[PDB]
UniProtKB/TrEMBL annotation, chain B:
NAD among keywords: yes
Classification via SUPFAM superfamilies: NAD(P)-binding Rossmann-fold domains
Protein name stated in the entry: Short-chain dehydrogenase/reductase SDR:Glucose/ribitol dehydrogenase
Keyword NAD applies: yes
Alphabetized SMART domains for the sequence: PKS_KR (SM00822)
Family of this protein: Belongs to the short-chain dehydrogenases/reductases (SDR) family.
EC number per UniProt: 1.1.1.100
TM region(s), chain numbering: none
Stored Gene3D superfamilies: NAD(P)-binding Rossmann-like Domain
Coiled-coil segments: none
Top-tier EC class: oxidoreductase
A GO molecular function held by the record: 3-oxoacyl-[acyl-carrier-protein] reductase (NADPH) activity
PANTHER family assigned: DEHYDROGENASES, SHORT CHAIN (PTHR24321), ESTRADIOL 17-BETA-DEHYDROGENASE 8-RELATED (PTHR24321:SF8)
Length: 245, 235, 237, 245
């Protein structure tokens, strides 16, 4: 698959994370413009240098929980490239916190980043969305299988699935809204939990391996591409068969 | 059918609402103890009086979005009845708000009541949950069909479905955690045509499914959210 | 719950099975009339005798894959009790058969019993169904999780879920059509199963019957088209 | 959208149908070898000529309901191209038949073509499937929404969804098994339905249009491509938002 994104503009939050980096690389290689935001301004700027074509790249330090940063992100997209073709709210946190130990602060921090932030970005982006544009949300296996020790994480990822359906109705026919639901992907997000459970996870997985960040990115690219022109409201499971939904 | 909830205690938020009253009514008729909360104390107290078994009913003014009121709600259940058998976080708001017009305040108010509040009640309730207890969440057709002009509402009701699955895992085997997803509960003609059962649902038809999930008839059901919508949508 | 099924009639195939017997026992204890069918006539009659209200029980030898036996089953319900309130096509086979080893006969046998048979029973039952009646199909965890070595079985139980939705539309508002999808029912790999099951036990057949009874009852009067997972949380669908 | 399928072999039943033709065109344009089957061989060969790189196309008259024709189809793929990379059992029938009027013959006809035939093709294909191969089934909106007057059709398409999950477990990791669930597609299958129901369908569809056959083919191609390399067991809704599943 080869994506033709020349002169199409991607806004991607959490761009320095494992899946975020894979998304940026694939879209950049496909000729797209990138507006990358992240809470870690130093890593993002350094990472962007390696992908380097500054004519097609703009970066900004942005907190997913900040409504004003969503406004800055859209204004930068409008100023640099004149609009938005693809919107991907990838920024999120994954905290292991058994429910009996979950503090009110624990709960609010996960909802603010994983859910409120997605609202802020989608809402501020509306005037900048172009014809044939795409929003792609990031759900998770946990929304479908049920989180083991992360009821707040699971809640926000179930919210992603339904929010995708709602916005798919409201922004049609101009904009399509879809999602990707990753399974177990090897990134720093999962590194500590997964180091003693790699064999167990592969044994449970029909494809017998962990997912790669690029295998999430390629599905996001598909959903943004003309190959998905009649797909809207839909969240796709990308988990090697570890779970059937 | 017929439920035997004698000496078992229901905690119900938003108890003065349409579905809320139906739930309180059924569980009360079933012999249960009731701890009812609502933002409208006066309306609630009048309703609770109409059921007339005051020794089995306790009411309190509680804002579903307030963690302090959740603590007071659980303490009241502990004080009057010693624990919680059924926890039903029913309180919620349904605001029609096209997404292009949705304010940050619009968004937060719906998340705070419909989602944060469910976290507060469930978390504070943990020490009070008895053996064989149930949590039953209220999802919505909108979670599955996609809301037409209520993206914040749909988000919170998709969150209920996944949060139900998460807590079912963590609170098992002592407590089962399930949900009910109501359809259209009493352009009516279009709805009748679209509904196989050709009518609107009654609040009593949501309450009876909640009671089923709380009953021993559902003893091997957990994590599950049931569609109660007359066939208007298949999920 | 306690179900009031007096003067209401259940037609149940595979009634001598583990789940089948639990359904019959519950409905009979609830006052219902029973039309029980099974391929094993002697075992069924012995079971039916134990319930002891022979005026409320009628049995017949019937092959679920036989359209003629479906016709005979409904005629028996008509003759003894005048109609059908609850139709539960419970008969099914579960064959372990890795796909690379699956014969054409293996495939056909499972489709014939688990899928063709449900069609024949539902189709022939239509004139006998009463008002406020229910059909409750039996799906399976395998339909949702994906069968490990039973692709034919899994296909038939996915068919149940979609056929339930279809008949729900067509047979409403007179009849509601729903399903129950059992998980792992005691009816080894026990350590593995307990580890994956939040409730930390196998399901009991009586716990499938009580959900079917719920779906047949007025408590489910606004539920149609719906298949309920009854699996102790082993799988979330 | 364009894919790179050179030297990979597609076996496609019902190749002369609306969606079938769109699948064949895309894969051929993408450099694949085609083994096309249909009950209407004159139609198929006439169609096969128009795409014409004829050395990369092999056609055969084959009845999906025949186990022997499935063997002949696989044998042709083996003889001409040495194996099978993509297996797409697209042949199917759609009969409007109210359940109260449905004959036993009606039932068996639909289960035989739409379900037994898929078994015959998948089972006979096993020895010929190559590394990194894909099976992609065709489900339907009817499996999820519930057919209005086609309980046998709805049953077979629900079977596709569950059979896809089962085979993804058994044929992994060598083969991924996925599905596509089309909505309302502009095709002969829907000409009769949409003569009286066109207004309602566009009203109910967020994208406010009928789907095109090519918009099913592009999603099938995605599932066969490396972009879906971590997707198995999965059936994707391609319905313009008319139904959220
Ligand atoms: N296995 C997996 O990694 C997995 C599985 C399922 C779903 N997901 C989801 O996919 C998304 C991306 O995962 P990932 O691998 O990139 O995660 P990650 O933890 O590796 O990276 C997330 C990135 O977001 C940044 N970030 C954190 N808080 C932020 C904030 N307030 N504002 C802005 N940026 C912030 C982090 O610095 C990091 O660069 C997340 O939403 C995650 O929940 C991941
Ligand atoms: N048709 C329906 O009513 C319908 C359909 C689908 C889902 N649901 C869901 O079912 C649940 C119950 O619905 P209902 O019929 O009782 O709704 P309702 O609108 O009739 O209930 C409103 C009640 O909740 C109270 N309330 C409002 N905000 C509150 C707060 N902050 N704290 C405490 N109480 C508060 C109000 O005072 C009132 O008594 C809700 O979660 C709703 O979203 C309802
Ligand atoms: N663990 C489980 O038992 C389980 C799990 C998931 C789903 N289900 C499904 O639930 C349903 C009921 O299961 P069960 O516990 O009764 O199964 P079972 O194997 O205990 O019951 C088999 C019974 O069906 C009868 N039978 C077999 N072939 C028949 C035919 N051709 N015609 C008529 N009767 C026939 C046999 O005589 C026997 O009494 C089945 O459809 C099954 O696939 C069962
Ligand atoms: N709108 C749609 O067309 C639509 C929507 C949802 C799902 N689907 C499914 O997608 C698949 C492809 O549909 P389509 O648009 O190609 O349908 P179609 O009706 O256009 O295809 C008919 C073609 O299949 C052939 N065919 C019929 N019976 C056959 C048999 N026994 N053996 C072999 N070939 C046979 C016919 O000769 C003809 O060439 C089918 O499984 C269909 O159910 C279609």
């Amino acid at each position: 698959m080869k994506f033709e994104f020349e002169n199409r503009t991607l806004v991607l939050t959490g761009a320095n994370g494992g899946i975020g980096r894979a998304i940026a690389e694939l879209f950049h290689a496909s000729g797209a413009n990138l507006v990358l935001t992240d809470l870690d301004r130093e890593g993002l700027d350094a990472f962007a240098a390696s992908l380097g074509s500054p004519e097609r790249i703009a970066t900004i330090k942005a907190d997913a929980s900040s409504a004003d940063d969503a406004e800055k992100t859209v204004a930068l997209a409008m100023e640099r490239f004149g609009g938005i073709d693809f919107l991907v709210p990838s920024a999120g946190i994954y905290q292991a916190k058994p429910f009996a130990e979950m503090s009110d602060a624990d709960w609010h921090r996960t909802i603010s980043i994983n859910l409120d932030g997605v609202f802020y970005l989608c809402k501020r982006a509306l005037p900048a969305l172009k014809e044939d544009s795409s929003i792609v949300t990031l759900a998770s296996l946990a929304a479908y299988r049920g989180a083991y020790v992360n009821a707040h994480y699971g809640a926000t990822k179930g919210a992603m699935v339904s929010m995708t359906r709602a916005l798919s109705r409201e922004l049609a026919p101009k904009t399509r809204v879809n999602g990707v639901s990753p399974g177990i992907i090897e990134t720093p997000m999962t590194s500590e939990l997964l180091k003693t459970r790699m064999d167990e996870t592969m044994t449970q997985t029909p494809l017998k391996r962990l997912g790669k960040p690029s295998e999430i990115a390629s599905v996001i690219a598909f959903l943004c591409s003309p190959a998905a022109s009649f797909v809207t409201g839909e969240t796709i499971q990308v988990n090697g068969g570890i779970y059937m939904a």
